[PDB]
Ligand binder design. Structure first.
Ligand SMILES: NC(=O)C1=CN([C@@H]2O[C@H](COP(=O)(O)OP(=O)(O)OC[C@H]3O[C@@H](n4cnc5c(N)ncnc54)[C@H](OP(=O)(O)O)[C@@H]3O)[C@@H](O)[C@H]2O)C=CC1
Ligand SMILES: NC(=O)C1=CN([C@@H]2O[C@H](COP(=O)(O)OP(=O)(O)OC[C@H]3O[C@@H](n4cnc5c(N)ncnc54)[C@H](OP(=O)(O)O)[C@@H]3O)[C@@H](O)[C@H]2O)C=CC1
Ligand SMILES: NC(=O)C1=CN([C@@H]2O[C@H](COP(=O)(O)OP(=O)(O)OC[C@H]3O[C@@H](n4cnc5c(N)ncnc54)[C@H](OP(=O)(O)O)[C@@H]3O)[C@@H](O)[C@H]2O)C=CC1
Ligand SMILES: NC(=O)C1=CN([C@@H]2O[C@H](COP(=O)(O)OP(=O)(O)OC[C@H]3O[C@@H](n4cnc5c(N)ncnc54)[C@H](OP(=O)(O)O)[C@@H]3O)[C@@H](O)[C@H]2O)C=CC1
Ligand SMILES: Nc1nc2ccc(C(=O)NCCc3ccc(Cl)c(Cl)c3)cc2s1
Ligand SMILES: Nc1nc2ccc(C(=O)NCCc3ccc(Cl)c(Cl)c3)cc2s1
Ligand SMILES: Nc1nc2ccc(C(=O)NCCc3ccc(Cl)c(Cl)c3)cc2s1
Lengths: 250, 248, 251, 245
């Protein structure tokens, strides 16, 4: 049997690069998506063509609500249903937008999305992963800039901080079960869709190492390392993949 | 006119000590509470006996829900209606219990993330929007990177509060509102905890082998709101007697 | 009687502001200086005119060498000789200059000054202070809020300030059983270099979120005063940033 | 031809594991040593037998003296001499012993600050000066924020090494030289009952890290899979640093 992995928000961008690279390493993959139905199915088709029966999709809103636990349970369940095991969880899915403290989503909704996807869903997915339980491991996508945050991004920042706390707490608690829990913290990687090219180059020029953003593959590379046999004593660790960005003063 | 302060969970223990010290410092105080009505009123009466019309109480549940934003807006409002201004917010209220990975889970999330993180954020928003030496102090936790076993949601909330501290410091600094934290290690231990178990914690503290008094925590809060902290924002002061420096 | 404090590099700038504030709080002070003799004696004079017999000077190079331990021992001894006690040590003295990796002091000299003043002398003074102990004893170390986002080409300075964090933690742990607290104060941008030009100063000022200005020497001293006070009696191993939010600002 | 690595203190324990793994990965390697000539040569023998003329040794004392600079220049040199290039520097060599606040102190400084911090800084300068996937890996310590009682100078030096890692990453990024750290917890350990005490504290498997586990992290950091990673310190501690008092 090949080991199996769940990757959240795996339809596009970094999650996709992680799913692809896990697959290329021998994993069967559950491709979680929320809205990117077409891109999801397209990836699974591409992976299944490469080796049949090695990729499924699973749809779920990771917004906080009273039913998020059941949705997270379902994501993990889908991996056992498809593949009879679940060896790796990658908590990649993420909402990211400004929530200024000083003044068309309600604040209730902003909290639900930013805290639910970035922190609560990871926690619930971790809980379901552990409960349904080898080289078992969880990788959380954190954020190298969490201590030098973007202005007006307090809820996102709060969620990413909470994710660091989850990384530590679950590493401690799940170690006796042989499950390792680690983090990968991008600096600037795949830049947003609705962002101009002056503004892209603004960000690029701040990166000491090469004056450019991370490829999604460069982020995936770190994920690969942490799940691998080369990381069997690593737990509770967060690896920044930021080209020095977090070292740069204002 | 005397400045005013809101202290959440102010009825008992650390928040009580904070409210009293701010009062003794010359502040008028909103004593926020959840269940502890009798304790909150009795504190208010004592402070008002010391100085007339300087203390009011305000009831609210800080658990995460669709109505928490309204609740927090009202807390801040209560300070303005009582005293005509709101100079200081102390985010002290906290839920703290284990949530093992292996009450419903939704309730646990709502209580531990709502009280520890989301309500502070909502209160911070309301405080800033309704605007001197304005400042916010959040009660953090010195042991957040060396957490208690099976306290993941608690720890996530306290980490989130560190993020809020930093993020709000950055964003509110142009308005002249400072935002800082106080991170106790072991302070007031549960009353009902056995002395032999309290002693296990006490013995771990390098500095004097005892827990912090509530007054010692309040002392750091007083500093951060004071004119001696006018350039300090986005700082978290550990008040932990060296406990976080101690290896396993 | 009145408590006594040693403040290193106290002739000018932040060290002076710390000595002054400790003095105004009722402390007797040793003003340590290296080169700034005129300025040291002037300050002691001012303080002595305010209350007599309350300020002494003490000269010492804090560059690392085989005699640095003796020099640090002597600084501490100066306090016991003048005032009969030593309650507070402020490690303020600091060398600060670029040491580029890829490149007229020798490298030997750079290491001795930047690592000596910023880390080894604090460690030796800490040892001497604690050993001489026979109340509210504490040590405050002047750290740097920007140690994790350092200036380009300042590796030795940054290494010494990182060592000083390590000293702060290690000494807080070890000395707590003796009742000695050890904490730090970490400025961001405070008094800018005397040599720096106004346009350069203003570039730095505009980076500070809280007020777009540097900390005053007094504002730094305020935090020192808090940590030595009875208001900080349970605080040890803490480093308080006094930086106006500067360390939170991304590139 | 094939890339070349320097590993300091590579004769035994953690440094040897790093040396072997880099060799296995296809690096030509300099095995630096202070005292352990026998061990160094023996390792050299083993690696040359697998692949001819791909491992040399280098003597240098890394204590803090007026000659440390020259020593560190020599070490980097010997890599360019043997192999005509130097792709990777692993700063592994390290001293470790208590220095209570309550050997002359300056030997202590020269060892604990000298070997642990100043020589890395000097080797970094020489490595950089003489310049691809170039990078430097510094052996840090995961327990730096919760230090052993009475280990102030040691702790100070390891904190200084974090400072160097960050400052050098920033400064050398323009030249395509990455600079990173690996922070072991309890690895190869002292009595046997004392050692057991430590093992039981570790969340992940109640045992010390093998030297090879440390070396694995180094390998990752030098590899093409880490081409965007600089200024990062990877803990390899089995979760020990997460455990409270
Ligand atoms: N990109 C960067 O430069 C950096 C990224 N990171 C972190 O790395 C990770 C990957 O980054 P990146 O690829 O840019 O992320 P994206 O912003 O592209 O988001 C990843 C996926 O998250 C999913 N998602 C969003 N909201 C929800 C929701 N309510 N329910 C379920 N899924 C949801 C989306 O799925 P769908 O499309 O199917 O709706 C989306 O495609 C994230 O955790 C991010 O925070 C860290 C810092 C830098
Ligand atoms: N004591 C210690 O050793 C430590 C404390 N801290 C932090 O210090 C701060 C003060 O500590 P401490 O006094 O021990 O705190 P407590 O655990 O005693 O709680 C403080 C107050 O929080 C309020 N609270 C709890 N749940 C809710 C809720 N759902 N809605 C509204 N209010 C609620 C309660 O108000 P009411 O009684 O009126 O219902 C309670 O009196 C906290 O933020 C805590 O996490 C951090 C480290 C250790
Ligand atoms: N100023 C700022 O913006 C910032 C300051 N800091 C820290 O705050 C503290 C105070 O800063 P600031 O007042 O600007 O410090 P200065 O740069 O003005 O230096 C203070 C004193 O250090 C002494 N000193 C320098 N080299 C030696 C030596 N070899 N032997 C003995 N004494 C020596 C000098 O004494 P003398 O004049 O007698 O020769 C000098 O007056 C320092 O530790 C500094 O690193 C941190 C970050 C920002
Ligand atoms: N082992 C552990 O549990 C821990 C490891 N680490 C770090 O991992 C690395 C490896 O640790 P470990 O293998 O135990 O190291 P050791 O303490 O065993 O020493 C490593 C090597 O350093 C060399 N060395 C020591 N002093 C000098 C000197 N003055 N001049 C030149 N060379 C010198 C020696 O080479 P030679 O034999 O030729 O003299 C020695 O074999 C170190 O950086 C250490 O701090 C971090 C925390 C804990
Ligand atoms: N889900 C996402 N999280 C983050 C976090 C940070 C960034 C980022 O740095 N974008 C460039 C401004 C972009 C994203 S996308
Ligand atoms: N709102 C609160 N937050 C906190 C955070 C930490 C502590 C604390 O340190 N309590 C004592 C130590 C301790 C550790 C572990 C457990 Cl099960 C328990 Cl009942 C108590 C106590 C509280 S109360
Ligand atoms: N002993 C001293 N230590 C420090 C540490 C930091 C600073 C400081 O922040 N100075 C202003 C920033 C700065 C940045 C770059 C350069 Cl060339 C210079 Cl002359 C100064 C100044 C000093 S002085």
């Amino acid at each position: 049997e090949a080991p199996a992995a769940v990757v959240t928000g795996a339809a596009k961008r970094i999650g996709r690069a992680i799913a692809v690279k896990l697959h290329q390493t021998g994993y069967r993959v559950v491709i979680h998506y929320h809205n990117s139905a077409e891109a999801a199915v397209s990836l699974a088709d591409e992976l299944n063509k490469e080796r049949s029966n090695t990729a499924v999709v699973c749809q779920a809103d990771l917004t906080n609500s009273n039913v998020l636990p059941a949705s997270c349970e379902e994501i993990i369940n889908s991996c056992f249903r498809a593949f009879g095991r679940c060896d790796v969880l990658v908590n990649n899915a993420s909402a990211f937008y400004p929530t200024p403290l000083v003044q068309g989503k309600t604040v209730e909704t902003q909290v639900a999305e930013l805290i639910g996807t970035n922190a609560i869903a990871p926690f619930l997915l971790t809980m379901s992963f552990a409960q349904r339980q080898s080289n078992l491991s969880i990788v959380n996508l954190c954020d190298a800039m969490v201590d030098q945050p973007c202005m007006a991004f307090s809820l996102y920042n709060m969620g990413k901080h909470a994710l660091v706390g989850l990384t530590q707490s679950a590493a401690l608690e799940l170690a006796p079960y042989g499950i390792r829990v680690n983090g990968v913290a991008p600096g600037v990687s795949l830049l947003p869709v609705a962002m101009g090219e002056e503004e892209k180059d603004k960000w690029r020029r701040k990166v000491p190492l090469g004056r450019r953003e991370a490829s999604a593959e460069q982020i995936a590379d770190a994920v690969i390392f942490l799940v691998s046999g080369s990381a069997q004593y690593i737990t509770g660790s967060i690896i920044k993949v930021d080209g020095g960005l977090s070292l740069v003063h204002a």
